[PDB]
Amino acid sequence: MEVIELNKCTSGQSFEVILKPPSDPSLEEIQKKLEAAEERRKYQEAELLKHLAE
Amino acid sequence: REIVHIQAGQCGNQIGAKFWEVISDEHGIDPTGSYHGDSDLQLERINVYYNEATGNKYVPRAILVDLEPGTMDSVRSGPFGQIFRPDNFVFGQSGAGNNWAKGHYTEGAELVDSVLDVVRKESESCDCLQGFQLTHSLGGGTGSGMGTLLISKIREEYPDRIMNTFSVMPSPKVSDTVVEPYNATLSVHQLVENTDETYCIDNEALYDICFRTLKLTTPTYGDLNHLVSATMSGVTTCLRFPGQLNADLRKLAVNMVPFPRLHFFMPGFAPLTSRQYRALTVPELTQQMFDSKNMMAACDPRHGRYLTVAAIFRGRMSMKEVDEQMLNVQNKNSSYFVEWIPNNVKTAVCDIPPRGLKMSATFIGNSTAIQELFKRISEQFTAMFRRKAFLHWYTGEGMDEMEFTEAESNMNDLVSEYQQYQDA
Amino acid sequence: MRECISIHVGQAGVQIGNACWELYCLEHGIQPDGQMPSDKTIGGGDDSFNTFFSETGAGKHVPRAVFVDLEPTVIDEVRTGTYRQLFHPEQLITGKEDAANNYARGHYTIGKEIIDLVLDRIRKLADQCTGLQGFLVFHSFGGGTGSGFTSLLMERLSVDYGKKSKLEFSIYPAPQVSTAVVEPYNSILTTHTTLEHSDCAFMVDNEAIYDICRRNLDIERPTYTNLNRLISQIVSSITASLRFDGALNVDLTEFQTNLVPYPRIHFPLATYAPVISAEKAYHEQLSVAEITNACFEPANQMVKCDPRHGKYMACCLLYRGDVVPKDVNAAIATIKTKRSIQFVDWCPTGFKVGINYQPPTVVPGGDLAKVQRAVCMLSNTTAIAEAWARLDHKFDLMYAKRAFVHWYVGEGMEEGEFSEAREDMAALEKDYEEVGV
Amino acid sequence: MYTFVVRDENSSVYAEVSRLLLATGQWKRLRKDNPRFNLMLGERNRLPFGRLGHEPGLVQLVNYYRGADKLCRKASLVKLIKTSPELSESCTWFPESYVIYPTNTDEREVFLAAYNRRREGREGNVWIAKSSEGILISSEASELLDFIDEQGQVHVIQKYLEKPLLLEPGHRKFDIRSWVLVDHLYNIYLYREGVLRTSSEPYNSANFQDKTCHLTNHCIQKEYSKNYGRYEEGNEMFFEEFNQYLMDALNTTLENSILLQIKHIIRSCLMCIEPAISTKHLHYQSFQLFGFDFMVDEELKVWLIEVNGAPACAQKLYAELCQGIVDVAISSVFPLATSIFIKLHH
Ligand SMILES: Nc1nc2c(ncn2[C@@H]2O[C@H](COP(=O)(O)OP(=O)(O)OP(=O)(O)O)[C@@H](O)[C@H]2O)c(=O)[nH]1
Ligand SMILES: O=C(Nc1cccc(Nc2cc(Nc3cccc(C(F)F)c3)ncn2)c1)C1CC1
Ligand SMILES: Nc1nc2c(ncn2[C@@H]2O[C@H](COP(=O)(O)OP(=O)(O)O)[C@@H](O)[C@H]2O)c(=O)[nH]1
Ligand SMILES: [Ca+2]
Ligand SMILES: [Cl-]
Ligand SMILES: [Mg+2]
Ligand SMILES: [Mg+2]
């Protein structure tokens, strides 16, 4: 159980204890998706309004 | 923020006027529209239902609709009648004679655009209109036929705002005319399609409560409307007062309605008050609010499963005890809540109690037992429709038998839908 | 000195940000109006606290923070509260209507129309940075804003800041304190959409914080105020190494390096001790051994689970107060003999240890007692995947019935995003199991 | 009223427990996938322990110890005994055993370095192979490893007890089965009534392929054996007959000759894994019933051979043993409106 990379300073100290050794899409690609769901939305609203017109 | 309230027809206007009396009392506003309570909590969310007019006077965001002037003259002459903006009274002269067609297709059609003009004037003066509420019966003509006509107009013009109805279902034990099952069937079809929540207030249930447990021998429409206005206060109390839940319309809609068409709610109130002084304990309140006998739709909760439940407690009480008692209900009757919606019973609290109670509870169940209500209507409907009885009052206004056949089919479809989930 | 920017999204993110910044001001002796008398470099600096604050000419110390909600009511309480002067109006961004507990509403519908204002305010903070290292993002899994707008934000931040680190502080859904039934949908959705844009996420299960507030603080019905002051203790414990002099976890890169060897298994478990009620009449202060041993009690974890049935991949110990290495070493040695701590074969069995001699700061009139030494263990154990199982299972039960899906599809989402996110989650669960059994 | 759930219908014991629990009138059974339970009588495989203890307002107890399989699978157990200091390689009561993987860590190069010293010292040298059907008892290695490698599972090979205690009249082998219940508090409860699963053929020390002498299993004894049922009903002698026979033929009792060693072995194994499986400070609780299998040799030394995590009871004893499970494992956690167990502690 050996203690390594001991650093000390006035605020504290830090170290390591080793007990045993080892045995993204683009901006266009996102604007595309956002506006495509906006198209699905505007279609659903159109279906609603055509149905209300019937 | 703002809600727009509409009340259509006789029943619609009577229960709506009682609603406004009740919540006006709660917010400390007198029949002239002036504030006079103690707490500032009474005014913090006052604009959800009241417009602030010159003089710091508060005017309900309410539109009053009828096809005959009787009930609304009665309202203007009544206890809080002068609180309502007089422009907001919109009436024709000829009535609708308990006729859904006259409400939807002919007379109501002639009055509907002026009602919409007032709705628009009220809406454009809102910062953040969250939606609408309608009080109406489904058994008469103005309420059902012109109310659902309005509802689809409003949906066309405001497709993205919430639509809630408080809807009085007809029972033969409390019945005006024999064509109520027809008027209600036509209406349910509209309601299944164009509202976000519908509070199913069966008139049978109101009568039974008045009779059995309130020992009222011969209940008036008043005795029934008192129950309704107390219940509506309870379900809007979180919208109207500040608390740990910033309560709005859409969030309740999204959480209560797993399937778009299955949005018909069993409401209930506790303790059931008349027109005693014993104090209730939190387990007592909780047991009553889930009691079939405290619910305003005449369905047996034990004959279905709760899809979702909203419990609302009012008054000062221990949150720990409320939480324990809610948990004991769900855990001791877990068969009756669908397991495929985990933790489907949500509890809110409002610190301010209603008038004359220190503690009370309001229940909103989206249970499959509601199918019973629709079965009843449907039986009553078919009993006349298989003989085409009374149809002339409608075909003489333009309607076809085909439209009746369709509404019957769609309500049977709604019944099958509720059954599907009762066995899933 | 390399700056860190905190983004607080949605109600939970905003209120937890409030707690954390209140705590930071106390810890660095910064008053509510932003003056730091201890700072002698007026109007500038590259000290370690400047990672989290900037300075103005008047000597005003200003959080490198942005708050975002799709509705005004919460950030309005920021704009009027004890620390109103602290933040600059442009940092507090609100909408008009929120995402109504709908992931789709925050990601697609209401998000799209605010993402650019948010990115521009973030850029105005970044342009004040000499060497920005990345972002600490605070949000709930359950809310609509917290899930959908956070994942939108996360995507755009990867694009506009590809070389910077992003760390999450996540609030995982607990029914006791939840007001919505669709939180499992929102959780799974956002976990899937954020998984490749997050370098390390610290999950906090409200269930665990709630029960810690009940048992160890003797509060019968914990409020968000209680939960948030305890959460901010933990969060300060985790970020002190960025805000103070030290040699352990000094930049966001080191959190990934020390805690995340496999970038998909990037959910370290926090355990914290001691949580002691300020109303406790007589309290015997706990020793280095007692609190390090408490670190291996699940009752002290931010997520209830069982590290004994799983494997560790990394373990950091962060102390605050009267601690010195030989005590820590003795405590570790004796704990290893009495506890089940197994590492993955391809990792060293060991602990990276950080001590800060200043004991924890406590908010005056809070629920937490002052103690002379405290510790936050950060362990990347595969046992945390228990939470995922729970969440996934709840999700499966609703989605079998398409319950509530219409609400999401009606905002533009397609049904297939649901089972895309669930299949990502299933891959995640199987990663954890292959690492850990 | 309490609520419980069943997720293993092929469990004889917990079937009877469900029955008794219902007859109490204070326990009601929910459907298998209802989460709002107090007691989960779970499945044997992939019991979802990560979903227990997260239901507010409910105390959850489960009839299995997560992690107990380390004791209840043969290779698991051999690795546990050799690596646990509490037990030790030099274990005086577990037969010399080695874990061997198929051709397709392993111990056969460790195995040979002891095997051939057994052959050279001119000692008896019979070994038996088994994996958690398929048994080889042989005198030279190239049969054992050959056979292990025909299969495809991890295996263990164990010193086959060539000089077992033999029951007369019959000159026949037997094994001891003890039922132990560990409650949430990690009380260890050894059940008063164990059983002898006996052979009915005279132990043949010559050719180790006559399965009926060497294998005490209840099924291999009912099917292929000559005299199934000659001496005792069901190849099942119980503890009073065994005490009496030890008294008469050997001038000892069951307690002193065998039971002290059984209690020591049970308590040692359970206490060994206690820090790894105990639910003392957990958000859910565990109990479990285990079956321990022992072999007494001619010198009256007790050997442990397997622990079984889902045991079947003896049909004479189901009633009493399941009632005891209810009394001390269930009603201890969920109280209702001269004990049959001995607590092991030292
Ligand atoms: N610990 C903690 N949890 C919170 C807090 N506020 C909300 N939550 C949890 O967060 C989830 C709800 O998400 P919110 O943050 O309120 O939702 P939102 O991001 O504002 O999104 P909207 O749906 O648009 O209002 C639930 O699981 C709540 O219990 C908080 O202040 N502290
Ligand atoms: O809207 C009406 N009643 C009403 C009553 C209570 C709350 C809200 N609004 C919410 C509800 C919410 N979650 C929530 C989900 C399910 C159950 C509950 C339960 F606590 F009630 C709360 N979150 C924000 N706002 C609205 C009447 C039509 C007029
Ligand atoms: N609960 C209640 N029900 C009413 C009231 N008035 C009428 N009804 C019911 O409403 C139906 C008649 O509807 P009504 O409102 O008079 O029709 P409208 O004026 O044409 O809309 C019948 O089923 C009556 O039972 C009332 O004041 N309270
Ligand atoms: Ca400075
Ligand atoms: Cl970059
Ligand atoms: Mg009438
Ligand atoms: Mg919000």
Side-chain angles (χ1 to χ4, degrees), chain A, chain B residues 1-55 57-424, chain C residues 1-95 97-437, chain D residues 1-142 144-162 164-346:
Chain A
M1 197 169 135
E2 294 213 322
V3 156
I4 40 153
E5 271 230 327
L6 175 54
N7 206 70
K8 282 137 61 63
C9 71
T10 51
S11 313
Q13 52 203 291
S14 56
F15 62 101
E16 174 157 6
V17 183
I18 311 204
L19 291 189
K20 295 143 196 83
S23 38
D24 301 5
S26 80
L27 170 37
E28 312 84 33
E29 271 170 312
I30 282 164
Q31 300 276 53
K32 181 276 205 205
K33 182 193 56 193
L34 262 42
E35 283 163 11
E38 198 187 16
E39 298 313 334
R40 282 188 281 307
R41 268 199 321 279
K42 202 168 153 234
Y43 171 100
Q44 283 147 16
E45 220 210 347
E47 277 300 87
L48 182 43
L49 287 165
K50 177 254 199 323
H51 178 273
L52 285 187
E54 313 176 77
Chain B
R1 194 40 128 191
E2 292 97 345
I3 289 173
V4 165
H5 162 99
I6 309 172
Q7 51 189 63
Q10 190 165 27
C11 175
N13 271 279
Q14 259 146 20
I15 76 166
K18 269 271 316 172
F19 167 77
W20 283 100
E21 303 178 2
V22 167
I23 73 156
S24 283
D25 169 83
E26 296 200 356
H27 293 268
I29 288 142
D30 66 19
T32 71
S34 311
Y35 174 66
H36 276 338
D38 40 309
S39 166
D40 302 41
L41 299 152
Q42 290 177 318
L43 279 178
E44 192 187 307
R45 296 166 82 48
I46 196 59
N47 62 315
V48 165
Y49 279 107
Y50 299 77
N51 273 344
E52 199 145 12
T54 37
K57 276 214 157 163
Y58 304 95
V59 195
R61 199 168 302 101
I63 298 154
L64 298 93
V65 169
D66 212 341
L67 284 173
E68 73 194 356
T71 309
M72 303 197 325
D73 286 356
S74 212
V75 164
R76 231 188 280 98
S77 287
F80 280 73
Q82 300 279 315
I83 216 181
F84 295 109
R85 208 175 74 81
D87 268 357
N88 277 24
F89 288 81
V90 188
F91 59 87
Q93 279 295 333
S94 44
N98 295 288
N99 194 323
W100 194 89
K102 293 201 167 178
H104 206 83
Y105 288 129
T106 61
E107 316 279 345
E110 179 164 355
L111 189 60
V112 73
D113 283 3
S114 39
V115 179
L116 283 160
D117 284 330
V118 181
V119 170
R120 192 171 311 111
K121 211 215 244 172
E122 284 284 2
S123 307
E124 307 169 328
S125 143
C126 290
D127 293 330
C128 191
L129 168 79
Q130 24 183 340
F132 305 89
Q133 52 184 64
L134 168 73
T135 62
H136 65 144
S137 80
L138 301 197
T142 301
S144 62
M146 209 213 185
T148 54
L149 182 70
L150 278 169
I151 276 164
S152 79
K153 301 279 174 198
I154 295 166
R155 180 163 189 203
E156 179 176 55
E157 195 167 320
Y158 309 83
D160 65 337
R161 313 309 222 232
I162 286 299
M163 182 80 235
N164 296 324
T165 65
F166 297 92
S167 301
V168 172
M169 317 316 240
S171 179
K173 328 182 207 170
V174 186
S175 181
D176 285 357
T177 76
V178 297
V179 299
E180 292 164 2
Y182 284 138
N183 299 330
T185 297
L186 295 168
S187 283
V188 158
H189 190 358
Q190 306 297 312
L191 287 192
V192 69
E193 227 201 294
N194 297 325
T195 75
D196 284 298
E197 311 153 13
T198 286
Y199 292 83
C200 302
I201 303 163
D202 190 302
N203 252 2
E204 214 200 322
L206 308 181
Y207 181 87
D208 285 342
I209 283 160
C210 282
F211 183 55
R212 310 208 201 297
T213 97
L214 291 200
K215 308 304 174 189
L216 308 193
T217 82
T218 30
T220 58
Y221 272 126
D223 299 309
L224 275 48
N225 293 346
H226 151 87
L227 256 45
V228 174
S229 60
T231 306
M232 294 178 64
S233 178
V235 321
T236 62
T237 202
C238 290
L239 307 173
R240 307 180 279 113
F241 288 113
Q244 262 301 274
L245 175 60
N246 204 40
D248 68 45
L249 290 183
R250 188 170 316 271
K251 270 178 186 200
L252 183 77
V254 166
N255 284 293
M256 297 295 296
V257 185
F259 302 110
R261 292 144 56 70
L262 313 184
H263 63 276
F264 290 91
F265 297 163
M266 230 156 72
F269 185 82
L272 271 160
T273 168
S274 156
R275 299 187 286 153
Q276 197 55 350
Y277 325 79
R278 287 176 177 115
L280 308 97
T281 72
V282 164
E284 277 170 331
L285 224 38
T286 299
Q287 198 270 335
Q288 281 181 63
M289 77 166 334
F290 280 86
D291 203 317
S292 163
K293 282 185 288 243
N294 285 43
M295 271 158 217
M296 320 264 153
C299 306
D300 201 342
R302 291 209 189 231
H303 288 173
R305 305 175 89 206
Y306 288 112
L307 301 164
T308 72
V309 175
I312 289 118
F313 290 85
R314 295 186 70 169
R316 249 169 66 260
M317 58 195 100
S318 102
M319 280 334 297
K320 191 207 158 120
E321 226 170 331
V322 165
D323 288 342
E324 311 183 357
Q325 284 312 286
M326 287 313 298
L327 284 174
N328 300 186
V329 169
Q330 308 177 69
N331 284 342
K332 295 226 216 144
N333 308 100
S334 63
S335 38
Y336 290 133
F337 304 76
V338 300
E339 80 269 24
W340 40 273
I341 303 183
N343 324 110
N344 60 340
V345 184
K346 291 314 189 181
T347 325
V349 164
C350 178
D351 302 320
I352 312 178
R355 185 138 210 72
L357 294 155
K358 294 182 159 207
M359 285 188 359
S360 68
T362 303
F363 172 95
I364 313 174
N366 187 355
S367 163
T368 57
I370 202 55
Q371 80 176 279
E372 289 187 355
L373 191 151
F374 301 120
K375 281 154 135 191
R376 259 136 51 195
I377 316 293
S378 187
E379 274 161 31
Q380 301 163 24
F381 175 108
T382 293
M384 321 193 263
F385 188 59
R386 63 172 172 188
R387 302 295 284 278
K388 283 133 104 131
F390 301 96
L391 265 207
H392 71 98
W393 300 121
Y394 299 86
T395 57
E397 296 297 304
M399 292 193 32
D400 197 351
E401 304 187 5
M402 189 72 231
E403 182 163 351
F404 280 76
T405 297
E406 283 160 12
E408 180 193 53
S409 277
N410 309 142
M411 204 166 45
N412 287 326
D413 284 356
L414 176 69
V415 157
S416 312
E417 246 235 292
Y418 273 113
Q419 244 303 329
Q420 178 181 19
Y421 299 110
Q422 210 175 292
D423 312 328
Chain C
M1 180 285 288
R2 291 185 72 199
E3 301 89 342
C4 283
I5 293 182
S6 296
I7 302 167
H8 313 272
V9 172
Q11 177 176 122
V14 162
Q15 300 194 147
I16 282 163
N18 267 317
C20 291
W21 287 101
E22 198 211 332
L23 194 48
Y24 297 169
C25 291
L26 288 196
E27 292 182 358
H28 303 281
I30 302 179
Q31 291 153 350
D33 47 314
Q35 285 296 304
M36 186 161 151
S38 325
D39 190 1
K40 307 315 214 245
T41 88
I42 313 201
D46 51 4
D47 304 344
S48 264
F49 72 94
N50 293 124
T51 322
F52 275 54
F53 297 81
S54 63
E55 303 188 44
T56 67
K60 214 200 150 203
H61 294 64
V62 171
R64 290 188 204 275
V66 86
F67 291 66
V68 189
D69 210 357
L70 303 182
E71 60 103 352
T73 45
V74 178
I75 302 192
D76 281 333
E77 286 303 282
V78 172
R79 301 197 244 244
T80 61
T82 294
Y83 293 83
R84 37 175 164 302
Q85 304 172 236
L86 209 74
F87 311 88
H88 179 112
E90 321 225 333
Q91 293 164 258
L92 310 196
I93 316 150
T94 47
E97 336 182 336
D98 64 43
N101 300 165
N102 192 336
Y103 173 89
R105 208 176 164 79
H107 188 87
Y108 296 95
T109 292
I110 287 66
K112 204 167 155 313
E113 39 155 290
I114 204 185
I115 191 54
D116 304 309
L117 191 55
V118 189
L119 287 189
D120 280 46
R121 303 304 180 71
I122 294 171
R123 178 72 69 185
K124 288 206 191 121
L125 271 193
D127 286 351
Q128 273 227 286
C129 291
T130 73
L132 179 85
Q133 37 169 330
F135 305 102
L136 300 86
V137 188
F138 301 74
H139 67 100
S140 76
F141 281 4
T145 304
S147 69
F149 184 77
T150 290
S151 70
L152 184 50
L153 189 32
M154 275 318 228
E155 275 176 341
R156 272 280 221 123
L157 281 191
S158 287
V159 186
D160 299 17
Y161 303 80
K163 281 198 83 223
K164 327 286 187 303
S165 277
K166 301 192 282 305
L167 265 62
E168 286 180 273
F169 289 93
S170 289
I171 303 278
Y172 170 105
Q176 264 149 310
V177 86
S178 154
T179 207
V181 318
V182 296
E183 293 186 43
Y185 282 170
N186 294 339
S187 298
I188 295 319
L189 290 176
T190 204
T191 293
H192 162 70
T193 306
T194 312
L195 204 44
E196 292 291 313
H197 307 264
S198 204
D199 302 299
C200 170
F202 296 110
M203 268 196 298
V204 183
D205 188 344
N206 267 352
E207 175 200 72
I209 307 313
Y210 197 82
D211 285 338
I212 289 156
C213 283
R214 288 207 279 154
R215 280 178 346 241
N216 302 339
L217 296 187
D218 297 313
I219 296 140
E220 264 170 324
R221 214 273 182 91
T223 61
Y224 285 143
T225 306
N226 306 132
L227 306 193
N228 288 343
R229 287 209 271 223
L230 176 60
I231 289 170
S232 53
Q233 286 299 321
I234 281 82
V235 168
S236 175
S237 189
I238 299 168
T239 58
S241 54
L242 304 155
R243 303 142 34 224
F244 293 113
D245 190 4
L248 176 67
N249 296 341
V250 276
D251 64 17
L252 305 172
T253 321
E254 208 183 332
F255 278 88
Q256 171 282 116
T257 285
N258 291 341
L259 298 179
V260 193
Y262 275 158
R264 249 178 100 77
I265 303 331
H266 66 64
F267 297 92
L269 172 68
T271 325
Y272 186 82
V275 172
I276 312 282
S277 169
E279 304 306 308
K280 204 180 180 183
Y282 170 66
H283 173 57
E284 304 181 336
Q285 280 308 315
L286 298 110
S287 63
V288 165
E290 290 173 316
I291 69 179
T292 306
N293 195 44
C295 287
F296 301 80
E297 231 53 63
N300 306 324
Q301 293 162 190
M302 304 302 115
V303 180
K304 289 218 219 333
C305 58
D306 196 344
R308 297 174 300 173
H309 303 113
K311 288 176 180 353
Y312 292 79
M313 285 156 278
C315 186
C316 285
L317 286 158
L318 310 173
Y319 296 85
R320 295 184 96 164
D322 182 45
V323 189
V324 292
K326 84 169 320 176
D327 295 331
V328 172
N329 288 353
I332 292 177
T334 86
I335 288 162
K336 229 291 177 166
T337 73
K338 274 151 109 63
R339 295 218 182 248
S340 324
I341 303 165
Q342 177 102 290
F343 273 62
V344 296
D345 292 326
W346 48 284
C347 286
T349 304
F351 303 75
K352 284 188 172 85
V353 183
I355 295 170
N356 212 265
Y357 300 131
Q358 216 44 41
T361 302
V362 292
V363 153
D367 309 297
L368 276 205
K370 220 252 198 171
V371 299
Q372 47 197 207
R373 59 194 68 77
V375 60
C376 187
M377 187 172 61
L378 298 187
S379 54
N380 197 345
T381 171
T382 69
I384 202 167
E386 289 177 28
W388 296 136
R390 290 163 61 217
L391 220 46
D392 288 337
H393 172 74
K394 281 184 192 311
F395 176 108
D396 288 336
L397 282 167
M398 272 155 95
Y399 190 71
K401 261 57 155 193
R402 261 40 154 191
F404 302 97
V405 184
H406 67 106
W407 283 114
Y408 294 75
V409 158
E411 296 287 353
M413 179 151 344
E414 316 197 20
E415 203 185 70
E417 188 161 357
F418 274 87
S419 33
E420 280 184 26
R422 181 60 179 95
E423 223 48 22
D424 203 6
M425 292 303 280
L428 195 61
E429 279 210 71
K430 274 192 204 13
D431 293 331
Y432 273 95
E433 217 206 20
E434 80 185 2
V435 180
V437 202
Chain D
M1 179 129 39
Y2 308 108
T3 71
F4 78 97
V5 197
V6 167
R7 297 165 66 91
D8 182 20
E9 323 255 28
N10 303 330
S11 202
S12 334
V13 47
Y14 287 114
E16 170 81 8
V17 187
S18 330
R19 266 194 298 282
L20 297 141
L21 274 152
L22 292 168
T24 65
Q26 327 188 21
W27 277 91
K28 76 164 174 94
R29 174 178 170 182
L30 315 161
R31 165 74 288 128
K32 58 140 104 168
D33 307 320
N34 186 340
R36 302 186 171 276
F37 56 87
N38 296 113
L39 181 38
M40 191 210 266
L41 312 179
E43 55 259 49
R44 271 177 20 170
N45 332 101
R46 320 189 74 55
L47 189 161
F49 291 104
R51 304 209 301 266
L52 301 168
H54 295 276
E55 279 313 318
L58 281 171
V59 166
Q60 291 194 319
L61 173 72
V62 70
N63 69 336
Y64 277 93
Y65 262 98
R66 184 182 199 197
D69 56 287
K70 267 190 334 203
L71 208 77
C72 296
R73 179 249 218 161
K74 311 213 163 313
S76 291
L77 184 59
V78 178
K79 305 288 190 153
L80 177 64
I81 301 209
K82 277 151 162 272
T83 76
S84 267
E86 322 199 26
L87 313 184
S88 209
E89 191 302 318
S90 46
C91 181
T92 90
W93 42 265
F94 195 62
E96 178 145 359
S97 311
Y98 299 86
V99 175
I100 317 298
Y101 289 99
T103 170
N104 272 55
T105 279
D106 190 287
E107 271 197 298
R108 75 225 281 161
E109 288 169 312
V110 190
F111 163 38
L112 315 155
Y115 185 105
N116 278 97
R117 311 204 163 231
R118 283 244 154 199
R119 193 209 191 121
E120 291 168 310
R122 284 227 101 191
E123 302 203 66
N125 189 291
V126 192
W127 301 83
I128 172 186
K130 210 302 207 174
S131 91
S132 211
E133 61 248 7
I135 325 92
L136 180 61
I137 320 179
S138 152
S139 300
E140 82 162 49
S142 283
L144 305 170
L145 310 112
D146 207 347
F147 167 52
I148 292 197
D149 261 329
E150 180 158 67
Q151 268 71 10
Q153 339 301 338
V154 66
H155 267 75
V156 57
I157 56 177
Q158 196 149 86
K159 182 310 191 179
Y160 184 78
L161 313 171
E162 296 153 14
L165 173 69
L166 293 175
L167 274 182
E168 310 288 5
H171 193 258
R172 63 223 165 90
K173 170 183 305 232
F174 71 101
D175 67 50
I176 296 263
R177 152 69 61 86
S178 304
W179 291 279
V180 185
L181 178 58
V182 184
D183 67 7
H184 58 295
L185 305 169
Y186 222 89
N187 298 319
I188 290 126
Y189 292 108
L190 168 62
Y191 177 44
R192 295 188 316 212
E193 295 294 353
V195 82
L196 310 191
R197 296 109 79 81
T198 77
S199 183
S200 326
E201 174 263 11
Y203 190 66
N204 156 280
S205 327
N207 205 357
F208 297 116
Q209 84 106 39
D210 32 6
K211 333 197 83 170
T212 341
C213 46
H214 307 307
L215 288 42
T216 47
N217 308 5
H218 187 312
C219 79
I220 299 190
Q221 272 291 122
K222 194 188 313 310
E223 296 279 278
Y224 307 167
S225 165
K226 188 186 161 237
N227 317 273
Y228 172 87
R230 204 228 281 234
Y231 318 107
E232 330 90 31
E233 194 207 315
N235 282 190
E236 282 189 0
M237 172 173 22
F238 295 34
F239 266 2
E240 185 168 17
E241 183 159 339
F242 195 35
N243 195 61
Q244 203 69 245
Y245 167 79
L246 289 174
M247 280 216 280
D248 292 334
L250 264 291
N251 201 27
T252 330
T253 56
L254 176 51
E255 274 285 348
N256 309 16
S257 64
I258 289 171
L259 230 41
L260 280 188
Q261 282 172 95
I262 290 196
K263 307 200 240 195
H264 167 78
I265 290 162
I266 280 155
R267 229 200 57 232
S268 291
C269 287
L270 291 172
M271 280 339 203
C272 170
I273 55 159
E274 202 217 75
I277 56 134
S278 160
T279 62
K280 180 165 160 209
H281 286 135
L282 228 45
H283 40 284
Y284 74 90
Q285 307 256 58
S286 278
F287 68 84
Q288 193 166 342
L289 178 101
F290 299 90
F292 281 81
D293 288 352
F294 298 106
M295 208 132 60
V296 194
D297 72 0
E298 64 188 7
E299 279 320 296
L300 275 162
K301 165 158 156 177
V302 173
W303 307 81
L304 174 81
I305 71 200
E306 90 155 335
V307 197
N308 216 273
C313 193
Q315 202 253 332
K316 188 213 278 183
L317 315 154
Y318 267 97
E320 201 195 25
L321 187 269
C322 296
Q323 179 56 52
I325 299 180
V326 167
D327 283 331
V328 317
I330 292 168
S331 294
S332 52
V333 181
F334 311 101
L336 306 167
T338 53
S339 195
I340 72 160
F341 298 100
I342 312 112
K343 203 149 131 50
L344 318 185
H345 50 41
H346 219 79

